[PDB]
Amino acid sequence: GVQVETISPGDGRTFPKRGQTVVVHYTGMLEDGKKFDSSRDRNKPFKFMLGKQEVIRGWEEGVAQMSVGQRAKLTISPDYAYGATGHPGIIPPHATLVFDVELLKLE
Numbered sequence: 764g765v766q767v768e769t770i771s772p773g774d775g776r777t778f779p780k781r782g783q784t785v786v787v788h789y790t791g792m793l794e795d796g797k798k799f800d801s802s803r804d805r806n807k808p809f810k811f812m813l814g815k816q817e818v819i820r821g822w823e824e825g826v827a828q829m830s831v832g833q834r835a836k837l838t839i840s841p842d843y844a845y846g847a848t849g850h851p852g853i854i855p856p857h858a859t860l861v862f863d864v865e866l867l868k869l870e
């Protein structure tokens with residue numbers, strides 16, 4: 764599944780809803796601690812819309828429980844991410860993913 768551990772609190776009241784655009788910065792790492800991808804490296808916040816099947820399940824479920832402003836660590840099992848195949852070249856097979864996610868804005 765996905766575990767959400769708060770790093771720093773959000774507003775405690777404004778949570779993502781279907782149809783809203785979620786704006787984040789994230790860093791993704793393997794259990795080894797090695798980074799596989801970061802929006803901060805690209806100088807560009809990552810945006811997705813909730814309920815449009817745009818992201819892995821662990822994101823859909825994990826970010827939905829964050830409030831605006833919150834920074835959290837999401838630990839995501841392979842079955843809530845890229846599963847047995849992974850994504851060759853980027854995400855290894857059967858990988859547990861750990862993301863540092865900061866919910867910057869809802870728009």
Ligand SMILES: C=C[C@H]1CN(Cc2ccccn2)C(=O)[C@@H]2CCC[C@H]1N2[S@@](=N)(=O)c1cc(Cl)cc(Cl)c1
Binds near residue numbers: 809818822853
């Ligand atoms: C590039 C941004 C997304 C990519 N996706 C959706 C997605 C889109 C196309 C292919 C694989 N996965 C995602 O579901 C997740 C979670 C949100 C932040 C990023 N990833 S990601 N960091 O695991 C990632 C995974 C992969 Cl296979 C490629 C890249 Cl460029 C990024």
